[PDB]
C-alpha cells in the first residue's frame, strides 16, 4: 500500500508559511484555553495521534489520509480531548480550504512546537485526504499503565528505536493530563518546549500514588507527574542512559526530537524524487509579527 505525496496544486513555501502564521497568530490569541496553557500542547498531541496509528507492516493508518476527520477515529477513546485541537484548526481550514487535512493536522503540531520555543521541525506537504473506509480502527495508540518492554515493543510498529522513543517522549514536558480524558490528572501547566521532562524524571522525588480514577501515577511535591510509561524510561537501563543524555544537553535533545518528530509525521508517505525539499517555517517572532 503506497501513499505518494502530491503537492496541493500550485502551492509553494509561502502558501504554507501563511497557514503556519494563521495557526501561530491563533495560538497567541486564544490564550485562555486549559487554564492559560493555550492550545500548543494539545496541537502537538493531535499531530502525534493522527500519525501514531501507522503500522509499518501494511502501511495502514498514518498522517497521510487525514482520517481523524472521520467519526471512528475522532471518537477513539485514546483521542479524548483532541476535539479541542480539531476545533481550534477549523477556522484555519476554512480560511485555507486548499490544504489537506493530514497536512493541516501535522503542520499544527510543527507550528505549536516552534511557537513554544522548541526546535525547528522541517515539514513536507502533500498528504492527500483518503476516504472514510481507510480510517484505522481504534486501539493502535499506546496504553499509559505499562512498562518499558511494552513501550519498546509498541514503538517498533512505528519504526522507532530507543533513542527516537526517548526523544519523542520529551514532549511530555508540555501541557498536562486531564482526568476526564485519560484517567490521569496533573502535571502543571507548561507551554514552553524544553528538556525539563528528563530533568524532572531524574531530579524529582517521585511517589507512586493512586489518582481519583483509581489509576497509578508518579507524583512529585512540585506538582509534576509521570505516567507509568514515562517512569519506565528511568527503570530500563538503556532508556535511562538516554534520559541522562537529554537532561544534560538541551541542543542534542532539540536536534533528536526534531528528526524523530518529522519522521513520525512522515511515516507511510512516499515523497517523489522531484518533490520540494522540506520547508523550515519562520516563527512569528523571527518575522517581527
List, as residue ranges, the binding site for heme b: 45, 48, 172, 176, 178, 181-182
Q: C-beta of 155: minimal distance to ligand HEM in Å? A: 8
Task: Find the Cα–Cα–Cα–Cα dihedral 238, 240, 242, 244, rounded to 10°.
Answer: -150
Residue 229 touches ligand HEM, criterion: CB under 6 A: yes
Residue 79 touches ligand HEM, criterion: CB under 6 A: no
Residue 142 touches ligand HEM, criterion: CB under 6 A: yes
232-261 residues in contact with ligand HEM (CB under 6 A) are 261
Cα three-residue angle 190-194-195, rounded to 5 degrees: 115
Task: Find the Cα–Cα–Cα–Cα dihedral 90, 93, 97, 100, rounded to 10°.
Answer: -110
Binding track, positions 30-69, relative to ligand HEM; x by CB under 6 A: -----------xx-xx--x---------------------
- 3-state DSSP percent of the chain in helix, strand and coil, to 5: 50, 10, 40
Per the listing, cell 518499558 goes with: 148
Half-sphere exposure of 118 (CA within 13 A, CB side): 34
According to DSSP, the residues that pair with 125 across neighbouring strands are: none
Binding track, positions 184-203, relative to ligand HEM; x by CB under 6 A: x-------------------
277: enclosing H helix or E strand: none
Q: C-beta of 7: minimal distance to ligand HEM in Å? A: 26
User: What is the contact surface with ligand HEM in residues (CB under 6 A)?
Assistant: 41-42, 44-45, 48, 81, 142, 144, 151, 168-169, 171-172, 174-178, 181-182, 184, 227, 229, 261
Amino acid at each position: 500500500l503506497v501513499h505518494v505525496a502530491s503537492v496541493e496544486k500550485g502551492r509553494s513555501y509561502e502558501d504554507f508559511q501563511k497557514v503556519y502564521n494563521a495557526i501561530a497568530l491563533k495560538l497567541r490569541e486564544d490564550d485562555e484555553y486549559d487554564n492559560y496553557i493555550g492550545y500548543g500542547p494539545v496541537l502537538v498531541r493531535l499531530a502525534w495521534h493522527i500519525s501514531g496509528t501507522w503500522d509499518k507492516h501494511d502501511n495502514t493508518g498514518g498522517s497521510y489520509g487525514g482520517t481523524y476527520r472521520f467519526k471512528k477515529e475522532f471518537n477513539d477513546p485514546s483521542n479524548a480531548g483532541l476535539q479541542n485541537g480539531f476545533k481550534f484548526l477549523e477556522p484555519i481550514h476554512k480560511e485555507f480550504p486548499w490544504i489537506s487535512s493530514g497536512d493541516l493536522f501535522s503542520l499544527g503540531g510543527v507550528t505549536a512546537v516552534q511557537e513554544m520555543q522548541g526546535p525547528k521541525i522541517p515539514w513536507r506537504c502533500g498528504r492527500v485526504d483518503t476516504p472514510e473506509d481507510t480510517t484505522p480502527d481504534n486501539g493502535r495508540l499506546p496504553d499509559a499503565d505499562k512498562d518499558a518492554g511494552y513501550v519498546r515493543t509498541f514503538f517498533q510498529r512505528l519504526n522507532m528505536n530507543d533513542r527516537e522513543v526517548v526523544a519523542l517522549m520529551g514532549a511530555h514536558a508540555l501541557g498536562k493530563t486531564h482526568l476526564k480524558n485519560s484517567g490521569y490528572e496533573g502535571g502543571g501547566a507548561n507551554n514552553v518546549f524544553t528538556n525539563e521532562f528528563y530533568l524532572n524524571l531524574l531530579n524529582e522525588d517521585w511517589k507512586l500514588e493512586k489518582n481519583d480514577a483509581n489509576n497509578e501515577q508518579w507524583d512529585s511535591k512540585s506538582g509534576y507527574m509521570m505516567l507509568p510509561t514515562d517512569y519506565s524510561l528511568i527503570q530500563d537501563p538503556k532508556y535511562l542512559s538516554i534520559v541522562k543524555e537529554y537532561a544534560n544537553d538541551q541542543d542534542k535533545f532539540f536536534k533528536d526530537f526534531s528528526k524523530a518528530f518529522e519522521k513520525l509525521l512522515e511515516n507511510g508517505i512516499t515523497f517523489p524524487k522531484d518533490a520540494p525539499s522540506p520547508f523550515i517555517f519562520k516563527t512569528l517572532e523571527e518575522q517581527g509579527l
